[PDB]
């Protein structure tokens, strides 16, 4: 699973077999680390007009 963003700590529980999470419009919200049992949120990098 690949992309770009800001990785931050998070407060989300998970089931031992789940790897990823999503928002409604098929958007990867969080990722679980393989090496350790941790959940990171992802936030878009700042942009604007």
């Amino acid at each position: 699973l690949t992309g770009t963003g800001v990785l931050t700590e998070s407060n989300k529980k998970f089931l031992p077999f789940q790897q990823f999470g999503r928002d409604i419009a098929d958007t990867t919200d969080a990722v679980r680390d393989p090496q350790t049992l941790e959940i990171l949120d992802i936030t878009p990098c700042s942009f604007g007009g």
Partner: protein
């Protein structure tokens, strides 16, 4: 005692709760209301 059944390709609607567990489902082919 034991039982046996066969699966078929069908369309379901599933409900997820905050903790993320399945709690209900609906079968599109059952009846017109579903």
């Amino acid at each position: 005692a034991y039982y046996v059944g066969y699966l078929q390709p069908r369309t379901f609607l599933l409900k997820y709760n905050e903790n993320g567990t399945i709690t209900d489902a609906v079968d599109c082919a059952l009846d017109p209301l579903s």
